[PDB]
Subunit: 297 residues, 4 copies
């Protein structure tokens, strides 16, 4: 039996104001997540622009998430991934010592480690701390794939590695994982297919869409865990169009644009190489947003 972080989770956006992390806005957005039934938040994942933050800013967002969730049931699953194991270890230890409840750790991007290397990477991380570690597979961004064999071996050799966030659009893989290792927590990292992953025994989502519609994502997720599949599928079907349009340009470009258009953040700011969407996609995002009910603060 392992310690786990599951349920509806939000891959938090990181709002910028004048190039700087807007810390008060960050906390406010987290409280809005908490108030709308979210079970955990993920500071500084892909959606949080982990690549363009400094290590110090990355750490600051984690503290803000811990502090804001303190005295609530909401857990902090801190973004702690890196393509350098020594950097990933550093983030894990910080997350550990500053009260994060677990870490999300993306597969190394760019340097394309072998399955053996991925094993050693995660093993080194998992042994550096005693908090839950969620693996994170997203081959379209990293250029590598953590195989099912490798994921299962890590779950079985490391006590704190408890599951994987899958963003590979491969439901066959999801069946493979849970058929051979039914003990692991399979987490959806692809909004459009939240329901199918939950209906196969997935235990949560780490969502982009929940930044905008946290009430609907947590409802979907909780319906599924309660085996009310008709209601979970209904929301998933409703959410399909926005779930897709939030990726008309690379995430987090559309979600931030949507949060801006909704009046949830003050400034539509990115750090290069990320930038505003074309005026066309701006209109498309405005188009889909208007078809949903968006919570305020």
């Amino acid at each position: 039996d392992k310690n786990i972080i599951i349920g509806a989770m939000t891959a938090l956006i990181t709002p910028f104001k004048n190039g700087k992390v807007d810390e008060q806005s960050y906390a406010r957005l987290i409280k809005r997540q908490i108030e709308n039934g979210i079970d955990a938040v993920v500071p500084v994942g892909t959606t949080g622009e982990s690549a363009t933050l400094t290590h110090e800013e990355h750490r600051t967002c984690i503290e803000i998430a811990v502090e804001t969730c303190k005295g609530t049931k909401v857990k902090v699953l801190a973004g702690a991934g890196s393509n350098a194991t020594h950097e990933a270890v550093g983030l894990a230890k910080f997350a550990k010592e500053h009260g994060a409840d677990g870490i999300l750790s993306v597969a190394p991007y760019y340097n394309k480690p072998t399955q053996q290397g991925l094993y050693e990477h995660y093993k080194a991380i998992a042994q550096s701390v005693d908090i839950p570690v969620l693996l994170y597979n997203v081959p379209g961004r990293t250029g590598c794939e953590i195989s099912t064999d490798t994921i299962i071996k890590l779950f079985r050799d490391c006590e704190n590695i408890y599951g994987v966030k899958e963003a590979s659009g491969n439901i066959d893989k999801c069946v493979d994982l849970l058929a051979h290792e039914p003990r692991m927590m399979l987490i959806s990292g692809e909004d459009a297919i939240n329901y199918p992953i939950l209906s196969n025994g997935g235990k949560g989502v780490i969502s982009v869409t929940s930044n905008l519609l946290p009430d609907m994502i947590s409802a979907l997720t909780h319906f599924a865990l309660d085996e009310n599949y008709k209601e979970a599928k209904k929301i998933n079907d409703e959410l399909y169009n926005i779930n897709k349009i939030l990726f008309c340009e690379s995430n987090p470009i559309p979600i931030k644009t949507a949060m801006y258009l909704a009046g949830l953040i003050e400034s539509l700011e990115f750090r290069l190489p990320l930038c505003s969407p074309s005026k066309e996609n701006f209109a498309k995002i405005e188009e889909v947003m208007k078809k949903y009910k968006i919570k305020g603060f």
Copy 2:
């Protein structure tokens, strides 16, 4: 719309000395019927459509119809082609010879546009008045029937009622049923039968059911009964055989497994298909042991 749904088997076609073993074909079909299968699909990809002549294709349809005649089991006849005149000819034969419906694969090799796909299927649909199921398998055809095309055909042609999806794309299944929840989405990919049914799919056209018809039919009927727990359990237990049956191109592994089970007399294909590599042969034999294979 009239439909054919539930648990269906994409029947293998047994050869003896290069010729279609008619008696064995009929016996294999009776075995499917006795194990609670709802429909059989003669001459699909699994039935080696490519290497049968038009005469043998027609004969296989006839045996299927006649074998299922006095039963509740329906015949969804394999009727696709990459040439529209051939496909229409097949469709009209199937209609006139007692098939309950037709399965019609997307044209392979010639890569039609979406407009061409539309006209292809519209031509087929207007040639018969029995249900037509579309069939998407881009990994084999080199073309994809898009979601929009599928939906237009479903809405424009009364007898077109759904699609067999073999694309390994659960996102598309969600896309399909969220925009047109009236269509019958049929699983053409055994390993993910359950996920497709749990999103509102209404049946399977299965390779694995040639070997394990009772388990595939049970899986499907649990799902249709909203007993997802039982359906998922079976889908998980079947994952090993489901995948190993595609260690080489279908239907190489399934015919190999049917042979190892003693269900067919000879492991015979028509070129360019041939028996599997000996490594894969052993993998198939080892996996089969985990399962209980019904006899005749």
Copy 3:
């Protein structure tokens, strides 16, 4: 090892009122001959092999043979099929009716293994005594003839002399000619004709040459003369027309282009192939204005 190499044209098949326009077919071939082409390829992918009947296919081969008879232009007949018995039949017909060699596409749709591909081509190569050229186009067929398999066939079969590559994989072309520099590698991809030739390829089987036979054959011969500057220059100039001819699936744009140029009477295909969109019709027409197109 007898070979057919140089500048070759994958001939379009003109239709008039649903039928093969045989007079127009012969006229287009004579145009090819008169513009420096070394060989024509009747009924390949470009020739809509999939929608022709076997009788129509055989007719087109005979017309090409007859038209080329008294010239030095060779007929490399399209004789491919996804069914080995069909491909053997086409191969034998081609030999018996005066074809100089055969092109034989890899089996589409049924995805045979490398072992299956070996036996498929070995059967074909042993059925006749004329040169056989292999044809790799994985985007259309869904299978790939591995370098190892191509090389075995080249070494095991006397009359198999090379491959037409339409895979966009220059790495593979390096692999082939590094390990077997005796085989004839043929470009089946116009846009990269020059890079394939400059690595030691000995010809092309072209779509573009239907419209611009003089430029393609000049390119090829410049390359064979090791005048690489001149070959690359033509290749770069042709890049735009080479790409626009694939804005929709081949041969939809090439036939549209021939119609625009006044080279065929009607813009007819056979379903599932159809007319291009007005937009793509305009793109092709726009691009065509940059090039000198040979008359009748």
Copy 4:
């Protein structure tokens, strides 16, 4: 100005976890003595991801100082997926004597074409040395489209070409048919000759770490339009060129260097590690077909 010809994506040797600086210098001298035109410190092959910014800076200084009294140029690895980090590296390389920079497309965060354009524009405007774009979609999860490369070439004076490692010869044709003024550089050893025969003007090689004499000969034969001799060497090199990617680069090349006695220890920084026993033997077998120059 431009930096072209035969170039080497330098491996970075480690000893006891630390960059072996003396070994790094000897390896560069060895490249210089074997006819190489330029070296590329800290590219993908040099484990850019796992070096700290400080160590990355040190490797650049060593390359510049080692090359200083020679004709060999230093094209400094200066890429990043964060534009601010990339501008920092670019400025450092300029200020510390680099002749130009190599800048890989942002990895992981997948910028749009507009973002890639602004990324490189910000970099190009920060220094007045040549910049070579670097496209490797299989590693970065994004591609610099032909249009974007061409706009950057045309809009930015010091952006002069692209290292292409995308296994797409159609792209190479596209690029040079529309903009033949750019320096297309091969970043894929197996197809060095095809890229050069199409108007490419150099290579940035993995294989040249082990066999610099052969890579520089191939490149110079090609540049002198002796395609016969260039293809001959490209063909001879095919086995080693492929085997050096039997596992992710630079895992096989470092293994090869170690087996050859060109580096002291087979040491990577996680998440990179030693190859499987099976691939270790394969690499060892292929190496026996080639003559490896010493120091």
